[model samples]
Target: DLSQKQALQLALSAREHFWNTMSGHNPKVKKAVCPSGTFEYQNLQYVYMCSDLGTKAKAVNYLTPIFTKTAIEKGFKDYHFTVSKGKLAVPIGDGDNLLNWKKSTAKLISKKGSTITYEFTVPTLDGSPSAKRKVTFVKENKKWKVNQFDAVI
Candidate 1:
């Protein structure tokens, strides 16, 4: 079995690659590509909440379905998420209102396995943001997949 640190490093490397691919940064680099059978899970609960808000807000929604479905297809068995209003460390002026905003930031409070936790901030379009969320990943059937419900129990 791989050490927890090793697993996290593997997951982050893969996540970077995935983001790079989505952003059209560099798709050919293989050195840091997540290891085969290495699972990389990201909790985008914030994204879903924003999506549910619909056109009521100017947030991205296309990515929500993709994340949800991908998790299920990848063999993730459980899924849960929540949303709430909160203060941003670096407020971008304007006002407390987020509607019509075009940028914001969110802190992802994630967990992997039973004893690991990871936190990172992701920027949202127009400054409208979502609350903190947790993410997890696990290897199943020799394949890696995000554990959507790892924090539920």
Candidate 2:
């Protein structure tokens, strides 16, 4: 986990990374398989990159964790993926893209002990109504990291 400020930084960095990477139009990002950025750690605790998988794993290792768990497992894995287009064996899944992802902000919602909360609003690609939503972080090893969040709605 990270400190309050550190956690916020990590969350924002992740958001930035998403904006830098990914695209609704497969042709634009196909060759660019993985999201780019550095983090104290990436991915859900139970999930991670394949050690020997090398470049393939290198790409997705940093991406899977940034997405909402349900989105990765359900929302994203089908129509959005381009098998050979990415460097990873299991390539990025596409669909129902969100975010202008480029423009968004996260503000601290609360801090009680080790847990820190943040609220953010990333507009939909279609310019649909998107509202500020909440995400939570926890300090781990002196750094704040997103422990959980609501990815939908």
Candidate 3:
């Protein structure tokens, strides 16, 4: 079980990581090596690495410790994420329109078994409507991983 504060913090971290990686703001770290998975977007082959928009050599890989296997497999299917091909081909300027999760606030929605759900509301930062969505986390081997994340811009 997680305290309310801990759950919120975890949710915040997950949100931050997702935005940072997707928005191509992630620092160039040697250890953030591209994974083995590869996919073809626009007839170009790319390795699974979350960075830059329309990068021919890389694409976003959601299959990481921050997300559960199920989320990577099924929950994000609508986003066109393919684990085998290392999907998620960011279009030009798509990353710039990412939802502002930095100013978001979360509240516990439910706690069932090893999963906890939090509803987050990202305030309207640029005249658009606020993005409010539910995100669920599951405890696996004592670590919290995102089970389902519905937040998107």
Candidate 4:
């Protein structure tokens, strides 16, 4: 029952956090902290929090599995690039990409027994008309956590 505006706001808040961290927008924050249950979780051993590129203890832990055995390591279309479980082939980038976001149109997309599917746009992150993505959020310990895109579908 989340409002369209609120849902988008929630997603944007998460996105902005990343955008801020990725481009060094926050000098105080060394890197992005992947929430405990979020997508950055890798099995029980690795959890990606605060990335310092190919360095940083956590970054190294997170990347070691995802860095790939040396796939072709390229492009956006190959969603499962290097790591067998790697979600996206390339990381999302573009300076302040969220600024270009217009308004997102959301839909129920699924039964709300528990988890909810929000079909919306990143609004920006690309130079095209717009790149729309499905981000599902699940309530974890009273907080909304990002769910795998296909979880709801």
Candidate 5:
């Protein structure tokens, strides 16, 4: 069995890989098929909650287009992820999207297998102050993925 720290690290690594792939970092695998009956980030409201495999797959399919467009518009080139003492953060930015005249950074925090949190500082396309976002993660297939709860919230 993996230690708590090891498990958390593994999950964090998976999450980092997922985000990197989402942002066009070109991971070996192009997509992640999450397990069914997964909860959204932090158990939020306003999203269609379901346990059906088809529903989950459909959700993933629906979100792909949006993510792709966002990735391209943001010019997500690469990511720098770091983990320490169970806390993780990734500084994500692009040459096209400059927040406050600077790049954006996403700070993600997580525990072993219980919970994960994300806070993003996103710059406006017009170079305004960056917007902040907070979200959570859940485990599926022993790997961590963003929960859908916060998707529509």
Candidate 6:
């Protein structure tokens, strides 16, 4: 069982790894997937090369301990994935909310049985309706893994 502080750290670390993996910025990922500073539009774009099953497999392996198996699989399914080489390119439009979550305020909202929940308040620059990110962790296989989360992957 993780203490509140330990759980918070785990969640944050998982969040960091999740974004880094999706953005192809994780040090463990291959540079060819989505090389840093690659220009797509007016600015440099960071994206996940979904079709590179090698990289995708690696990403899944690293995230497995942090998130539930179903959650990880669902994340891949949620993405409009494309391929590499002569195939289509992948986009990064779905990353906005996850990016903002890095700066959001997190609080332990609940704890019951073998589960815990955290709520995050994501602030918006335009004063629009703020986004709320929730993460639920459950004890599985004697490890605390994210059972569900808003904006997962």
Q: Which candidate is the best by lDDT?
A: 6
lDDT, candidate 5, at 23: 39
Model 2's lDDT to the true fold? 0.44
Worst 10 residues of 6 by lDDT: 35-44
Which of 3 and 6 is ahead in TM-score?
6
In order, what is each prediction's RMSD in angstroms? 16.4, 10.4, 6.2, 11.3, 16.0, 6.0
Q: Which ten residues in a row have the lowest lDDT in candidate 3?
A: 51-60
TM-score of 6: 0.61
Q: Which residue runs does candidate 4 get wrong by more than 4 Å?
A: 24-99, 121-127, 148-153
Candidate 5: Cα lDDT at 79? 28
How many residue pairs clash in each candidate at the backbone level?
9, 11, 0, 0, 5, 0
Maximum-TM-score candidate: 6
Candidate 2 clash total?
11
Q: What is the C-alpha lDDT profile of model 1 across 19-84, one tens digit per residue?
A: 432232233433322211111225331222112222212111222221233443232122222223
Report how far off residue 133 is in candidate 1 (Å): 7.2
TM-score of each: 0.28, 0.43, 0.58, 0.46, 0.32, 0.61
Which ranking of candidates, highest lDDT first?
6, 3, 2, 4, 5, 1
Per-residue alpha-carbon lDDT of candidate 2 for residues 1-153, written as tens digits (9 for 90 to 100): 344455445666555434333432223344533333222212311112122222333334444555433333342344233223232233333434465544556677788987767776767777788667666765555544454322322
The local distance difference test score of each candidate is 0.31, 0.44, 0.56, 0.41, 0.37, 0.60
Candidate 3 residue lDDT tens string, 1-153: 776567667666666555554443455443453344455656545445343322422332433556666654453344444333333443222344446665677788999999888877877657688777777789975788777543433
* Error of model 1, residue 109, in angstroms: 10
lDDT tens readout by residue for model 6, 31-118: 4454322225334243445433235566577677788877777766565434343333335655554335445667788999988888
Could you tell which candidate, 1 or 2, scores higher by lDDT?
2
